[PDB]
PDB file of C-alpha atoms in Angstrom:
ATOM      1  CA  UNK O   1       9.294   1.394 -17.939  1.00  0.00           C
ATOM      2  CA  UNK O   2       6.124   1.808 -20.040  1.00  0.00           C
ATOM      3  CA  UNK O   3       5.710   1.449 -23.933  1.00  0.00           C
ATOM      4  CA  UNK O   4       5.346   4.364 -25.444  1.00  0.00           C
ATOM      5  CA  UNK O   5       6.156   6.745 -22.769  1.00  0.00           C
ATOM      6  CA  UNK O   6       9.006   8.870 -22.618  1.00  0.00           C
ATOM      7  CA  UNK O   7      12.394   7.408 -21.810  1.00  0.00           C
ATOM      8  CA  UNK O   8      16.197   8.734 -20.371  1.00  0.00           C
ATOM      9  CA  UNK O   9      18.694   7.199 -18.853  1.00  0.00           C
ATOM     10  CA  UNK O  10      18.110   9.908 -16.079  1.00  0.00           C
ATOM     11  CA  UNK O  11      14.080   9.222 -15.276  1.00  0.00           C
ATOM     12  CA  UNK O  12      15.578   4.980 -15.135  1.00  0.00           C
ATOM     13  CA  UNK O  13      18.265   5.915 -12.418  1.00  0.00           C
ATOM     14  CA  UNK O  14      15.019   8.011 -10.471  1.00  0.00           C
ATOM     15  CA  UNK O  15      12.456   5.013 -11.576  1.00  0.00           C
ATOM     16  CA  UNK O  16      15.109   2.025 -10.243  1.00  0.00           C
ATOM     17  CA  UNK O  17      16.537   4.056  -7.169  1.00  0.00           C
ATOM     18  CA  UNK O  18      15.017   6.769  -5.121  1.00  0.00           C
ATOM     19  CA  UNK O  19      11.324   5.452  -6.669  1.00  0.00           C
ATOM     20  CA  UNK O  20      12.127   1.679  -5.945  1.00  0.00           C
ATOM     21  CA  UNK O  21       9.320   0.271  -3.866  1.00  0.00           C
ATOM     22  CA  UNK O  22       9.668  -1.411   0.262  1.00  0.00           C
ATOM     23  CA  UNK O  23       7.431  -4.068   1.329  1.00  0.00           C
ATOM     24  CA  UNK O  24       6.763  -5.008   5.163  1.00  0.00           C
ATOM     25  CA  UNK O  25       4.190  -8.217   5.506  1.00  0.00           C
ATOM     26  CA  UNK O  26       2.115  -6.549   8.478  1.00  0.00           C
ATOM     27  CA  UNK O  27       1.763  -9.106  11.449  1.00  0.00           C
ATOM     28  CA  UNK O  28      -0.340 -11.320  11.735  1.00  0.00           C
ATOM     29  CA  UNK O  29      -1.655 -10.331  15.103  1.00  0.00           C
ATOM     30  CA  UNK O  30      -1.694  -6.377  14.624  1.00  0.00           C
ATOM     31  CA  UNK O  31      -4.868  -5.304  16.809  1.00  0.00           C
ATOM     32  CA  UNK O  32      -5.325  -1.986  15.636  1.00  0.00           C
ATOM     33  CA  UNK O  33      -6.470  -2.253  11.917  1.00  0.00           C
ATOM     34  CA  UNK O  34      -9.048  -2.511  10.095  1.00  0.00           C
ATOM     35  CA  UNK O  35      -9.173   0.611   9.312  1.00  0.00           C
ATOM     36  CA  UNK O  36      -8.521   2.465   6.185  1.00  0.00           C
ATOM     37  CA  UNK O  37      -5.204   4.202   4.686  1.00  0.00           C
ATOM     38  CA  UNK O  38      -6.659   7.371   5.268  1.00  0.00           C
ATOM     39  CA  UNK O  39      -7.736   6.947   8.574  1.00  0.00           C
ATOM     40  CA  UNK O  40      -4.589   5.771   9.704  1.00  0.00           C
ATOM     41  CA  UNK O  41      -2.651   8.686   8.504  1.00  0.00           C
ATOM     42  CA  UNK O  42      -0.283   6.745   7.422  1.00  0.00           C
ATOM     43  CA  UNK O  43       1.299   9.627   5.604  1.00  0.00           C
ATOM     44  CA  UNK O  44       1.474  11.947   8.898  1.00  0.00           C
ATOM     45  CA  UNK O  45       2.964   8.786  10.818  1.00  0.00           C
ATOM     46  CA  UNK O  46       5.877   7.376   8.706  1.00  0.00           C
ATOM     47  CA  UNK O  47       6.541   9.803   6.103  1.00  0.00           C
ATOM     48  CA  UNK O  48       5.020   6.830   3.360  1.00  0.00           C
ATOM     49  CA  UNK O  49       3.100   6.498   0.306  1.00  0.00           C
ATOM     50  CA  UNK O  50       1.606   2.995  -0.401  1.00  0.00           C
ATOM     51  CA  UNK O  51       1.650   1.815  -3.611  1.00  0.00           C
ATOM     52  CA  UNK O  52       0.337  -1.348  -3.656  1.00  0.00           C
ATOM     53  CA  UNK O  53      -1.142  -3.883  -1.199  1.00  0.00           C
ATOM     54  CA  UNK O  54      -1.288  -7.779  -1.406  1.00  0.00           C
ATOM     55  CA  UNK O  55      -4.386  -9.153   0.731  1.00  0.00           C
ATOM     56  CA  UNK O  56      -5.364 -13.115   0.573  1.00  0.00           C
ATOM     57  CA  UNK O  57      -2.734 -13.368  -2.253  1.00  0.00           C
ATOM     58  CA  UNK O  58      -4.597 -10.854  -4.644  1.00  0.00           C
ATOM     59  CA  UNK O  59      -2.031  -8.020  -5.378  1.00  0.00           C
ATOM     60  CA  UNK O  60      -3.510  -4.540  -5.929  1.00  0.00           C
ATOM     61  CA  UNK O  61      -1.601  -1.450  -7.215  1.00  0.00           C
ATOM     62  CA  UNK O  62      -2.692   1.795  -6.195  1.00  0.00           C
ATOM     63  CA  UNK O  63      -5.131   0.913  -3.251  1.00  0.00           C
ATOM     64  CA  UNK O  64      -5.425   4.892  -2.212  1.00  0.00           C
ATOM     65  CA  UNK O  65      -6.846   6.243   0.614  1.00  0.00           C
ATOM     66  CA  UNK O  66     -10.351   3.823   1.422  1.00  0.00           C
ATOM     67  CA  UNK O  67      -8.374   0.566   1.224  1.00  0.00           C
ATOM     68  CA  UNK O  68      -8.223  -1.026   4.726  1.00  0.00           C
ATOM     69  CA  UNK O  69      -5.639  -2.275   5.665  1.00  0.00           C
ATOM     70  CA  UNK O  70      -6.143  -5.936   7.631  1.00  0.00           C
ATOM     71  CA  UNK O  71      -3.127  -8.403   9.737  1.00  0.00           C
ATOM     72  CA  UNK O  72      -1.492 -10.056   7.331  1.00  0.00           C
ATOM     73  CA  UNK O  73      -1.299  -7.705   4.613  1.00  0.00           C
ATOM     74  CA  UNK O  74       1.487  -7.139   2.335  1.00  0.00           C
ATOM     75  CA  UNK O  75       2.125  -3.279   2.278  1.00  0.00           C
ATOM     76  CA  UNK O  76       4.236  -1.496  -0.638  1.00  0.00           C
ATOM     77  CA  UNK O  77       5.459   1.555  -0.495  1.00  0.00           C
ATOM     78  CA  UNK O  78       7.787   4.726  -1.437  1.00  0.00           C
ATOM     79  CA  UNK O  79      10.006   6.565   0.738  1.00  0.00           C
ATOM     80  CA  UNK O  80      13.313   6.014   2.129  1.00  0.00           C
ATOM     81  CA  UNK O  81      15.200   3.985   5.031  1.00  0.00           C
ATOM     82  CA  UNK O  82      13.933   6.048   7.488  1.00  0.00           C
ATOM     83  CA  UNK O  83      10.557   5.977   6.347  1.00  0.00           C
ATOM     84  CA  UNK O  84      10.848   1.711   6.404  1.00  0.00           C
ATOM     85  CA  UNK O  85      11.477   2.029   9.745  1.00  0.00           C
ATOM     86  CA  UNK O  86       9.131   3.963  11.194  1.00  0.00           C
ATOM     87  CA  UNK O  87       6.274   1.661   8.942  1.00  0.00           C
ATOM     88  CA  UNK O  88       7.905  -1.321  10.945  1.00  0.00           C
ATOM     89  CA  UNK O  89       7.564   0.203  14.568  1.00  0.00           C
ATOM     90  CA  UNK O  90       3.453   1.634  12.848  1.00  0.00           C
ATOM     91  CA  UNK O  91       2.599  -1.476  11.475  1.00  0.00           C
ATOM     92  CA  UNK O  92       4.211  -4.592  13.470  1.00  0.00           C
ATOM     93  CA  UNK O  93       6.358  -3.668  16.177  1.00  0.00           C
ATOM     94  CA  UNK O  94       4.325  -0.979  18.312  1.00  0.00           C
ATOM     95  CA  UNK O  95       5.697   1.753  20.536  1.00  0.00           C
ATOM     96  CA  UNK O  96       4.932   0.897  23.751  1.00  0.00           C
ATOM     97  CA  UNK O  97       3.694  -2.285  25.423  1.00  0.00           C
TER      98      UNK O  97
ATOM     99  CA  UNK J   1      15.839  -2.933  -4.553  1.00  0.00           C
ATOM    100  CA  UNK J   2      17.276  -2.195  -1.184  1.00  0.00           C
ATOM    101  CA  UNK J   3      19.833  -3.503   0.014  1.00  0.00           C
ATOM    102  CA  UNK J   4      19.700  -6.275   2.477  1.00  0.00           C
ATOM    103  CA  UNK J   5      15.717  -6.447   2.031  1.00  0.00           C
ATOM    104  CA  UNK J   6      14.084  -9.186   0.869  1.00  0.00           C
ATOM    105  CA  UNK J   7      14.634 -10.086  -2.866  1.00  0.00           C
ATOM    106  CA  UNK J   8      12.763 -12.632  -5.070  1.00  0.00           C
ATOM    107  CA  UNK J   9      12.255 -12.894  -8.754  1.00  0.00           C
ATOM    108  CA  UNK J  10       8.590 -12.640  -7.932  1.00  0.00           C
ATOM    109  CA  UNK J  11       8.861  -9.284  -6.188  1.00  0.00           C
ATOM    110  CA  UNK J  12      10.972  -8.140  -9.025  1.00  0.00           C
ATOM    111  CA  UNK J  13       8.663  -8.658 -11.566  1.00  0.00           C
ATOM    112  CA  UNK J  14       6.261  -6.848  -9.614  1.00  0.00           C
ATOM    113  CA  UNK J  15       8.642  -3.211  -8.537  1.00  0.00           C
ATOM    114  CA  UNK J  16       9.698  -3.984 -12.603  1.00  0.00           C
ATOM    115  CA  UNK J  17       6.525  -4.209 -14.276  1.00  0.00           C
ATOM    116  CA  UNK J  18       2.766  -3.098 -12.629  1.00  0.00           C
ATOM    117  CA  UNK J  19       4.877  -0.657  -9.619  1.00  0.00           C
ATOM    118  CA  UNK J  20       6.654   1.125 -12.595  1.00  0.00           C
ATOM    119  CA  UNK J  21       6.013   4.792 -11.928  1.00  0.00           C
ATOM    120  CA  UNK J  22       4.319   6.617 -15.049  1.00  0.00           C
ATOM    121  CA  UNK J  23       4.664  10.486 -15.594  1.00  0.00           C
ATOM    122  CA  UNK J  24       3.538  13.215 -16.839  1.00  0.00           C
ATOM    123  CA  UNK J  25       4.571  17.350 -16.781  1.00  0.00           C
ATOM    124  CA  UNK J  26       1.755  19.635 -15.690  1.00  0.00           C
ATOM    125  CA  UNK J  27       1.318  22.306 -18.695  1.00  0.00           C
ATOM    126  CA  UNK J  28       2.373  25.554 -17.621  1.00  0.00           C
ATOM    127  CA  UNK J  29      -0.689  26.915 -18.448  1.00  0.00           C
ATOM    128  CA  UNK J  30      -2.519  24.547 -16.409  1.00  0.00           C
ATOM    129  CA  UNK J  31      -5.253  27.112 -14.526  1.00  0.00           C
ATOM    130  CA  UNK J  32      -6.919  24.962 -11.218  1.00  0.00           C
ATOM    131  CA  UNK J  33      -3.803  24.293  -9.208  1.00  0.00           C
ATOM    132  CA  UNK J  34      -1.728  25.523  -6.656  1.00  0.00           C
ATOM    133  CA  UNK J  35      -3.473  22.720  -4.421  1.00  0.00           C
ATOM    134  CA  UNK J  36      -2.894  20.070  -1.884  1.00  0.00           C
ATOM    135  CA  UNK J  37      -2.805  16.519  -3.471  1.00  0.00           C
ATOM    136  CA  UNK J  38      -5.229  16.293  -0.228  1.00  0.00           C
ATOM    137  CA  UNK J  39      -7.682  18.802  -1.722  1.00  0.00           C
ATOM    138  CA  UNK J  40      -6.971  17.751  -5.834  1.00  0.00           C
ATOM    139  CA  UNK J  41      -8.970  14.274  -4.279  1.00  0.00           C
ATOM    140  CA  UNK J  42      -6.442  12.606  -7.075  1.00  0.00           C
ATOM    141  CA  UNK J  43      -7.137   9.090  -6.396  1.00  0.00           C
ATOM    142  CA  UNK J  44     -10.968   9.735  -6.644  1.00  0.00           C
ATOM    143  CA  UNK J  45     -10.740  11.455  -9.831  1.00  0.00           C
ATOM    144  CA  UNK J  46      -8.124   9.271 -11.586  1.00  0.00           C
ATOM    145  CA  UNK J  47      -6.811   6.332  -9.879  1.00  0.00           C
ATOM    146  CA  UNK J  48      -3.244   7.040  -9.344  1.00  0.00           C
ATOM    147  CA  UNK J  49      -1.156   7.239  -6.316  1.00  0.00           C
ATOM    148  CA  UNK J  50       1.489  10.251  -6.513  1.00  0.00           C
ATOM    149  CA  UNK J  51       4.581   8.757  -5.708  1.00  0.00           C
ATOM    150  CA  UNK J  52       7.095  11.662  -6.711  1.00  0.00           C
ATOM    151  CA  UNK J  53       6.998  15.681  -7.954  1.00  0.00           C
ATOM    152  CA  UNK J  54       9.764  17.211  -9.308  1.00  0.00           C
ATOM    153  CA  UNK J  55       9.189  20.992  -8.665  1.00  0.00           C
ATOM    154  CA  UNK J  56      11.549  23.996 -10.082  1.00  0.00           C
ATOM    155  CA  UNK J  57      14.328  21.312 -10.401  1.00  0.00           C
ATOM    156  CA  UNK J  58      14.109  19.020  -7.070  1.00  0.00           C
ATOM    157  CA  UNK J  59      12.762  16.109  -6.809  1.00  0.00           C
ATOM    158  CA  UNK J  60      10.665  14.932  -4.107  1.00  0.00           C
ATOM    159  CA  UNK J  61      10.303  11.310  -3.002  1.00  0.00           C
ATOM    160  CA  UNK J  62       6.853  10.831  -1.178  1.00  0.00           C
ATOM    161  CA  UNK J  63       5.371  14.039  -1.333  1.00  0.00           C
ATOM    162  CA  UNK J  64       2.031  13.212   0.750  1.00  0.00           C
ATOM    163  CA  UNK J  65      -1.327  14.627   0.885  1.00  0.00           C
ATOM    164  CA  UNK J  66      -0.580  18.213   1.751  1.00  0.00           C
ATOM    165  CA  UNK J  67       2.162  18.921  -1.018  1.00  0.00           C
ATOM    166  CA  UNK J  68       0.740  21.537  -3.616  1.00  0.00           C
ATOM    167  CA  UNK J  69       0.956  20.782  -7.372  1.00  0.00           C
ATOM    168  CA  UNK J  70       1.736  24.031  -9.244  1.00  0.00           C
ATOM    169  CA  UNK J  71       1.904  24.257 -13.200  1.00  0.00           C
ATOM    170  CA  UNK J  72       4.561  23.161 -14.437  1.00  0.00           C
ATOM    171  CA  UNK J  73       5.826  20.257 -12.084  1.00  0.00           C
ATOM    172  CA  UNK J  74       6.494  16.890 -13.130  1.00  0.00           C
ATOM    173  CA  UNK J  75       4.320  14.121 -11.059  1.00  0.00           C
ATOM    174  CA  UNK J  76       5.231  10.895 -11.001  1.00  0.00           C
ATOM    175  CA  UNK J  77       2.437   8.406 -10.193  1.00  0.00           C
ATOM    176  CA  UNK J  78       1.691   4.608  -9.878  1.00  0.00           C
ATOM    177  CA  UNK J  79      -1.713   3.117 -11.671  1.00  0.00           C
ATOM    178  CA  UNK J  80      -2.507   1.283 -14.808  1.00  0.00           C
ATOM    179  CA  UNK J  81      -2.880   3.214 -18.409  1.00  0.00           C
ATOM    180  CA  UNK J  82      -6.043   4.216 -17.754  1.00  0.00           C
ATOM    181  CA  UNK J  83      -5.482   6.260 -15.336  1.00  0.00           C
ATOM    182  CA  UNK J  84      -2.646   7.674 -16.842  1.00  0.00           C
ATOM    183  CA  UNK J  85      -5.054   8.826 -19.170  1.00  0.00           C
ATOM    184  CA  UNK J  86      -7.261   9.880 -16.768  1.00  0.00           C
ATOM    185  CA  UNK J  87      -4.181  12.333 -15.089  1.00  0.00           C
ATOM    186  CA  UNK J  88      -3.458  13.581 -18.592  1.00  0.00           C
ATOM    187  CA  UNK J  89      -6.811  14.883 -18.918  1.00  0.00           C
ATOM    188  CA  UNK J  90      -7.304  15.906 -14.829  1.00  0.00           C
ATOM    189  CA  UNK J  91      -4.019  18.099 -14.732  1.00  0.00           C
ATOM    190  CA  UNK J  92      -3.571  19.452 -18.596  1.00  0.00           C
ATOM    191  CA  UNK J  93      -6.251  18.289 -21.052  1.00  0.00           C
ATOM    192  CA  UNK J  94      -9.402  19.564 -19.487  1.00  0.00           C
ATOM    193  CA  UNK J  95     -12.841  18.186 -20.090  1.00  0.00           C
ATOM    194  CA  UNK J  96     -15.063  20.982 -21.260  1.00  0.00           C
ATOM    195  CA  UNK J  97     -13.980  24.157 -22.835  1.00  0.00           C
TER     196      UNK J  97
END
C-alpha cells in the first residue's frame, strides 16, 4: 500500500485479492503484434486491463493504450481466471491453425 | 497471487510495491462526468490505468474503456504519485475556476 494514503483492512483484502495482478510471457513467435494495446482491443477480446509490461527486461507500469505490444513481452494484468485464459488463447496459443 | 501461477520473490516485490493500486473517491459534486473511461482519454490526461470502480456499493474488477465514471465512485488506478496527483486534480480538484 502507499504512504500516506488511506488504509483498511477492507481496501488490503480488495488490493491483495480481486486487484492482484496475472502475468503471461507472450511467445516468442506470436506473428500478429506489433501493434498497440489499443489497437488490439485487448479489452473487447479478453475482458483485461494491462497494468504493466516488461519488454527487453525494462519493466513499465501503466503502459496504456499506445504501448505496442512485441513477442516476448511480459504482459500484466487485472481481471479474473477467466479473463487469464482467454489472454493465453489472444496472446500465445491462437484459435485456429 | 493466484494460485498455481507462477510465484517468485521478484514478481512479488513487483504486484507488492510499483502494481499497488492507488485510489481516490470522485467528489459528489464533481460536474464533467457521466463518461466512458474511453471518452475521459484518462491515460492521456494523467497517466493511470483504471484498474477497479466501486459504484453505489459494487465493486468492479476491470471495468474497461466503455464503463462511465459518475460522481461519487471510487476508482482505483495503477501509476506512480504523480499521477495520482494528476487524477486528484482531473476528477475533483479542477484546474481553473
Amino acid at each position: 500500500a502507499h504512504h500516506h494514503h488511506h488504509h483498511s483492512a477492507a481496501l488490503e483484502v480488495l488490493f491483495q485479492g480481486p486487484l492482484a495482478p496475472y502475468e503471461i510471457i507472450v511467445s516468442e513467435d506470436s506473428e500478429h503484434l506489433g501493434k498497440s494495446i489499443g489497437e488490439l482491443n485487448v479489452w473487447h477480446q479478453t475482458g483485461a486491463t494491462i497494468v504493466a509490461i516488461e519488454h527487453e527486461g525494462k519493466f513499465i507500469v501503466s503502459p496504456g493504450p499506445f504501448s505496442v505490444i512485441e513477442q516476448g513481452d511480459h504482459i500484466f494484468f487485472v481481471g479474473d481466471e477467466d479473463v487469464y485464459a482467454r489472454m493465453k488463447t489472444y496472446f500465445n496459443l491462437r484459435m485456429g491453425l
